[PDB]
Amino acid sequence: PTIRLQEDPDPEDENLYEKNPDSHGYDKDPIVDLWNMRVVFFFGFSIVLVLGSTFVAYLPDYRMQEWARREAERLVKYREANGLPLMESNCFDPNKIQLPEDED
Amino acid sequence: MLKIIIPTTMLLPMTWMSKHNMIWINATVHSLLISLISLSLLNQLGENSLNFSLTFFSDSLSAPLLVLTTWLLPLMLMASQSHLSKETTTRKKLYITMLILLQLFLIMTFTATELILFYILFEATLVPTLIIITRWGNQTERLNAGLYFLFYTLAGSLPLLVALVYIQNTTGSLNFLIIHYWSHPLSNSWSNIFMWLACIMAFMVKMPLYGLHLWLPKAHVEAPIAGSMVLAAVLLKLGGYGMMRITTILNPLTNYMAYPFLMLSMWGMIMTSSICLRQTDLKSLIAYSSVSHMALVIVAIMIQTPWSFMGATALMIAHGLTSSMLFCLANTNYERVHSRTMILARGLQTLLPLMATWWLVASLTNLALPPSINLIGELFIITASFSWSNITIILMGMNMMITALYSLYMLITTQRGKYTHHINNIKPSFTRENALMALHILPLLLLTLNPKMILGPLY
Amino acid sequence: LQYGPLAFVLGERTTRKLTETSKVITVDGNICSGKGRLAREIAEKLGLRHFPEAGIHYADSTTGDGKPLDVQLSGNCSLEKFYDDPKSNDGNSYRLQSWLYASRLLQYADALEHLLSTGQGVVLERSIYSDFVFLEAMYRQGFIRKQCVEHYNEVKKVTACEYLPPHVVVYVDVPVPEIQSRIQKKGNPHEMKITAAYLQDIENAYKKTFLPEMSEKCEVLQYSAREAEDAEKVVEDIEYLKCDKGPWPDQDDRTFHRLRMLVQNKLEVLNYTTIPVYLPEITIGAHQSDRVFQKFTELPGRKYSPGYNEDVGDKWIWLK
Amino acid sequence: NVLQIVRDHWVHILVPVGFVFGCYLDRRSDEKLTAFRNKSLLFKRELRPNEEVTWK
Amino acid sequence: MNPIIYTTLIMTVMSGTMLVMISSHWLLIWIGFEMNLLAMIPVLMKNFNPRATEAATKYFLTQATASMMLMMAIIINLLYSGQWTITKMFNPVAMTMMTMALAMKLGLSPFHFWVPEVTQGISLQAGLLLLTWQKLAPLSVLCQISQSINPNLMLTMAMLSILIGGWGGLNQTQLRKIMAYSSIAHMGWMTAVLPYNTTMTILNLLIYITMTLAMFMLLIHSSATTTLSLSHTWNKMPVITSLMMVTLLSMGGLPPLSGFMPKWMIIQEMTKNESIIMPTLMAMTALLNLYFYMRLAYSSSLTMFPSTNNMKMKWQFEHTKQMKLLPTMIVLSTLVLPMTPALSSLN
Amino acid sequence: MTMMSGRPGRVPLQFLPNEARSLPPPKLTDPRLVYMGFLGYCSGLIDNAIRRRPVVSAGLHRQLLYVTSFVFFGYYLLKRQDYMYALRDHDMFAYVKSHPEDFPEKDKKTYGEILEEFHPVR
Amino acid sequence: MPLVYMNIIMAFAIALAGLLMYRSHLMSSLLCLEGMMLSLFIMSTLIILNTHFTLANMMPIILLVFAACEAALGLSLLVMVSNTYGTDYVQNLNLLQC
Amino acid sequence: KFYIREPPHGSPDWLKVGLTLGTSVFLWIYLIKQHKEDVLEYKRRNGLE
């Protein structure tokens, strides 16, 4: 037969604009196509994007940034009023730390 | 956190019980709803994580990754329905099932409290990806790619398993919280060196590290568009997440065990950025771009500073979004002309102006233009590296130039010049592709508006 | 209950049902001879089940509804285009020959199953032992390649050795010129193109290979053109045959058990027809195979098992 | 007429029902980790005259 | 063969295995082995042909030699301690000979050469029986005498079995030989953990038996003995090929499939003793078995191979004989990992 | 090695000693039992698929029997597993109590007097 | 051990080496198998008689019985091999490879 | 429609269906009774109530 096997020919690609000039690129059926576009646009831009950004922008401060600022203001006021240094090089009281007896 | 896990397991039978022409609509709608649900995990604390149960927890490092995964699933669904139109209903449902199973495994991986459970899920992610690549890839190289994708992973991960169980026979627990609190220094012995290597090599090969990256071009080129999206944007970040997690038990060995990997990362970042300059394949260029960015992330994780961790987290998020957008942009042209050569279809700005705008924005974000989160991550990593050693500003600086070049190179090759005369099958851009581009690009700048959401726990 | 080892352990034996009229009969002959009419008359007179000659759509007639399917989903070959273009470059000739051999094997399995299950005799037109002559006629005329003959010989060697040859072989002799006269007077416009060399090759193959080798197993009843219309005399000649020389008398209960398990379960019968030898004439690409299989599965009574297709009126599915 | 509508679009409640079921299972998991409720040194508190538990 | 005679022979095989499993006397265990061999020899030659006769002869020679070494080891043990009970095997030379004989019976390397030949020479049902049921008795004896084993010899044979199984299975296009080499590697895995924990051995044996039963039933359902004949099944029944691919993935040991559970557990057990290098080498070597399972999956399920025309006829008929235990076997082979702790019921 | 085969007082082929009756039985809503039922349902679906029957709706009695059998066996399997783990913990605690010299309780030391080396990250 | 015990062990080892090293005939290997069985019988009888283990005196007889089975089995197989090749040569059993 | 007998007819095999449902219901009620008695025995042995 001078051939190697029985096979279908490779078909040409289908253009969705031929049977649907306004085809949205979702499906060959115009109605399912239009509703796929509508649901994508409504649930992607309207619901998730804008409302999610609004929700994230107004998330309550669980990182305690404002609380930390107020605490720092209190401590700075107190230590400046009573003349103590603003910070200490030791974050732990040496009275509760027991160094080894002998260093030699 | 079962309020997120269960709806995906419900996406499974909803897809398998859907009418033959309504699978895509239902899947996309409910995946978008699941992403909206997962948006609530961004409300993190400043001290500890969200310990939902004995099995699952959420942290400031894993919540952006979970949001990115749940947001990426619908994008894959939209990007896949074009080239799968002629498929049968059962095979379409199988493809959607693979995607859903991959999302479920990734969601459980990013929140596991246990290192063996993390290993099991982080290894289970291979089967759907391998099936997708080797079944729905287009050319005959895909089979080889699958093999390259498989064993490269497994040869790195099987030693890790051994190390993991060894640790559990020494400390008695592999729970991450107990591991963090009961941490002890690693001595300098050969056994500790090999334990370090076993704990590190799996995540270093999943990054991938330079020299161990040969699987990535194959896997990201022969895969379908959804496969490339998930491989580049999420599956590469498993290595980064795992290294950030596992490095808590490797100090102070890392202090000197990072030198070969730091050297490889920097020089191979330069090397892959240079490789991008001479690439006839447009998908391979994006793959090597991913390699360079992940080399930067490797450096950031290896130098072990708070600024480096912040920059690394931001860079992973930004790279995921950007690389997914670039792959989709390349796939549009591929679907139009059925070829991956970059110099085949030229001057496309004349024919597709809005697509050219999308290309310009994607390329501008790829080269880390301020104040994009790509730049924020890159600059934080560069500052941390400068603190590590002043000479690094040379190599990093070199990369900053080369990236820009190849980035604009791609644009100038594909959008400018004159159109090819014999190519006359370039139809106007569909609404689906424009929506895909917009849903990729708008979150990037929206996160630029509020950058502390992707800066990780060290913020 | 379905026949198996359990039915053999308690009760069922094939040897008891054989009542001197088992007598597998085949009525061979060249193209356009009156072998079919003689077969029907023999079956009527002896009270045996008559099997019409297996065609392209024989397997369709026994599964689902007996109506034939499309040629694209069944056979994928044409006798008419074999007559029009016997040297076509799409491999139609050997594809047709292979499909016809598979159909004949299936028909022989069905006939053996009926005989061994009910004890009633059967009368076939041609058999798997006779199909090869057509293949030979295709080879001498250059219609098929030698590789096709090798593949046919391999398949026949692995398949036809598992069954028992017919008890009595009836052959009808019609000279080639008379066959051509009958063909001309018939009227089918595709058989006018049968050259005399093809029929001469068929008759040569018959008389030189089939009859000599078949006579060693059992005696052969040969009849000229004129002495075949008298079916009563032919039947009375068949009846007084001394059949004690072939493999049939040497068959005991366990061999009949093996053969009866073989004849049912048609998949095991057709097992070796699709051996992975890649001839261009019979090999089909993956894309075409997938498309044709998807087309086949969409037929009204083919998606599920016989009793589970609600689109052809199957009820009570959810309790079956 | 709602028979066809239901048999066509009943797959749209699987995911919301899974969401509610997941919330309920999260609450069930929460109820099994109350061994230190109102017992931490940082949040130990006296009960109000009416309330029974500090959190659920 | 008569169905009654066949049933009697099969029951005699199982009776020999049970006699080995329930005895406390070395003579009775030896008698069980003899009876099992005697009843097994005709079962391998149910379908008579020269290849079946060659397989039966090779199997008989190997098993008779192994049984003679077994009896000699028993007699030496009796000589150095007048005991017949199966116990700590008071003599070391007798224990070396016992280990060698049981390894020869199981097909452990380097006494592995007979397994691929015998598997290839017999039918699929006989190969199923040989590769699943015939492993119980020697492994039961090995479990009973596990405290007196020499770990060096046993571990050497196990490592050799894994290596040789992978390397030999790398080169096969015949499905029966692939199954035999997989069996050799899995016996290596089973015997590597035997000196440390017999419960892990039993768990590995159970999971291997389930997976092998599923594989062999799927191979009988789709009448394929070569790779190319298996490549045709997608055009006749794709569900079978999909289940076969998932079963192959489970046999390859990938998470989250249940075939991952045995090796995992064994690794953990071998890490409770020091034994770090050996499990790492063992997993590295099991990657080879995974490789040729993946090659089979490529050939049969993930790509479509060309078909033949006569396959259209096969579209019109259904499978007549129906295996009742196939779905349960497949489900147990795949979706069993989450029930891992239930292994406590084994000890 | 075998830990529990030679344990004194063990009946050869019992599968459930009387002492196991002293433990709380698994709840019928146990997630492990639900997973066993899911396994039975999957087995029924695969049975439907292999026989070329409508996968979800073909045989409801067969599927229900599949689920019932899997749940029925899984209940006793879970009971035996829980009994075995209770036995393990019982023996562990008894052995620890009977060998005080091998499990000493040393003095607790607070972090304020333990010298831990500091490794700067720079 | 006395010298007779070691002589019987040497006989067993010689028979084992004879089986393991095939020349051409399967019958010679079968004879080596029977020689192994005979040596095992003799040694078991000597050990049982030396220690006056009365109830073990039946053990050698049982041994012989199963030896017969093996012998019969082997001979049966030999017949079939001969019927395939007209010779009992072991080089004819090479249809199956590794 | 089918040219052959199709031994599985329009009506299902009522004996097999009835046996299947009967076995399933018997197993379920046996399981419930066993669970009840196990709960009662456990409470009695530990003396909760």
Ligand SMILES: CCCCCCCCCCCCCCCCCC(=O)OC[C@H](COP(=O)([O-])OCC(O)COP(=O)([O-])OC[C@@H](COC(=O)CCCCCCCCCCCCCCCCC)OC(=O)CCCCCCCCCCCCCCCCC)OC(=O)CCCCCCCCCCCCCCCCC
């Ligand atoms: C079409 C798009 C195409 C695609 C593109 C991509 C788009 C993607 C979108 C995705 C979704 C986005 C969602 C993000 C959510 C973000 C919302 C949010 O967080 O709100 C924050 C913020 C609200 O702050 P807040 O924390 O909620 O309020 C806290 C206080 O309690 C409040 O203080 P108060 O007590 O004083 O009350 C103030 C109140 C009332 O105050 C007043 O009324 C007084 C105002 C002053 C006027 C006074 C004189 C004028 C009248 C005089 C004459 C009349 C009176 C006398 C009558 C006689 C006449 C003489 O006004 C407000 O509350 C602010 C307006 C609220 C806007 C919220 C934005 C929601 C966006 C979500 C939808 C996104 C889509 C866009 C659709 C939106 C519509 C198009 O909103 C703002 O944007 C504020 C910006 C205004 C500040 C001035 C700008 C300063 C510029 C300096 C920089 C210069 C450098 C150059 C840069 C120039 C750039 C401008």
Ligand SMILES: CCCCCCCCCCCCCCCCCC(=O)OC[C@H](COP(=O)([O-])OCC(O)COP(=O)([O-])OC[C@@H](COC(=O)CCCCCCCCCCCCCCCCC)OC(=O)CCCCCCCCCCCCCCCCC)OC(=O)CCCCCCCCCCCCCCCCC
């Ligand atoms: C982890 C979390 C939990 C997940 C658990 C794991 C996943 C799920 C469990 C897996 C087992 C379950 C199902 C197994 C039996 C299915 C066998 C089958 O053939 O399916 C076809 C069958 C369609 O056949 P049909 O309807 O009779 O008519 C169409 C024709 O038959 C036309 O059919 P055809 O035969 O002509 O089509 C030919 C096709 C036929 O070949 C197949 O259908 C492939 C099926 C492979 C069987 C899986 C092996 C055993 C399970 C192991 C899974 C491993 C998972 C671990 C992760 C690794 C990923 C592999 O072959 C191909 O096209 C070759 C393509 C090669 C693709 C390579 C991938 C294959 C393996 C992937 C397995 C992935 C998991 C299962 C996905 C779901 C499958 C339905 O699918 C179904 O309709 C059944 C699926 C839905 C049933 C459940 C519905 C539930 C009821 C709704 C209410 C929900 C209750 C919620 C409670 C709350 C109250 C509201």
Ligand SMILES: CCCCCCCCCCCCCCCCC[C@@H](O)O[C@H](CO[C@H](O)CCCCCCCCCCCCCCC)COP(=O)(O)OCC[N+](C)(C)C
């Ligand atoms: C088409 C042509 C377009 C051009 C024309 C456009 C017309 C104008 C529209 C452009 C707007 C210009 C931007 C100007 C900035 C104003 C908005 C800003 O003020 O809001 C920020 C708020 O921004 C939000 O925080 C960021 C949005 C969150 C982004 C989430 C994306 C949605 C999720 C989708 C999936 C994500 C995938 C990626 C994984 C991470 C303020 O941050 P913050 O300092 O706090 O607010 C303090 C006061 N609060 C706290 C009381 C509210």
Ligand SMILES: CCCCCCCCCCCCCCCCC[C@@H](O)O[C@H](CO[C@H](O)CCCCCCCCCCCCCCC)COP(=O)(O)OCC[N+](C)(C)C
């Ligand atoms: C293709 C890319 C793949 C990824 C590459 C991964 C990189 C892995 C490299 C491993 C990093 C270091 C390994 C060992 C740490 C030190 C290395 C050694 O050179 O340092 C000296 C070691 O001294 C000598 O070098 C002895 C080692 C010599 C033998 C090692 C073989 C090196 C050959 C290189 C082959 C390439 C390996 C990669 C193969 C793919 C230090 O002296 P010493 O104090 O005594 O040892 C410290 C340990 N102590 C404290 C317990 C004693």
Ligand SMILES: CCCCCCCCCCCCCCCCC[C@@H](O)O[C@H](CO[C@H](O)CCCCCCCCCCCCCCC)COP(=O)(O)OCC[N+](C)(C)C
């Ligand atoms: C891949 C999945 C593997 C599943 C394996 C088969 C599962 C179905 C088989 C059903 C078993 C029926 C047996 C019940 C009848 C009672 C018999 C009882 O008396 O046997 C006891 C034994 O009970 C059995 O061991 C329990 C069988 C349970 C096996 C299932 C565990 C598999 C691992 C976990 C995977 C999840 C399995 C899911 C199940 C569907 C006797 O114990 P003992 O005589 O003293 O031990 C002898 C051996 N020793 C001394 C050397 C230790």
Ligand SMILES: Nc1ncnc2c1ncn2[C@@H]1O[C@H](COP(=O)(O)OP(=O)(O)O)[C@@H](O)[C@H]1O
């Ligand atoms: N094996 C075969 N190969 C090719 N053609 C065949 C074969 N068998 C039958 N035919 C064709 O079938 C047609 C009718 O068959 P035949 O039995 O000879 O005539 P009739 O039906 O009148 O008895 C003839 O044209 C014959 O050529």
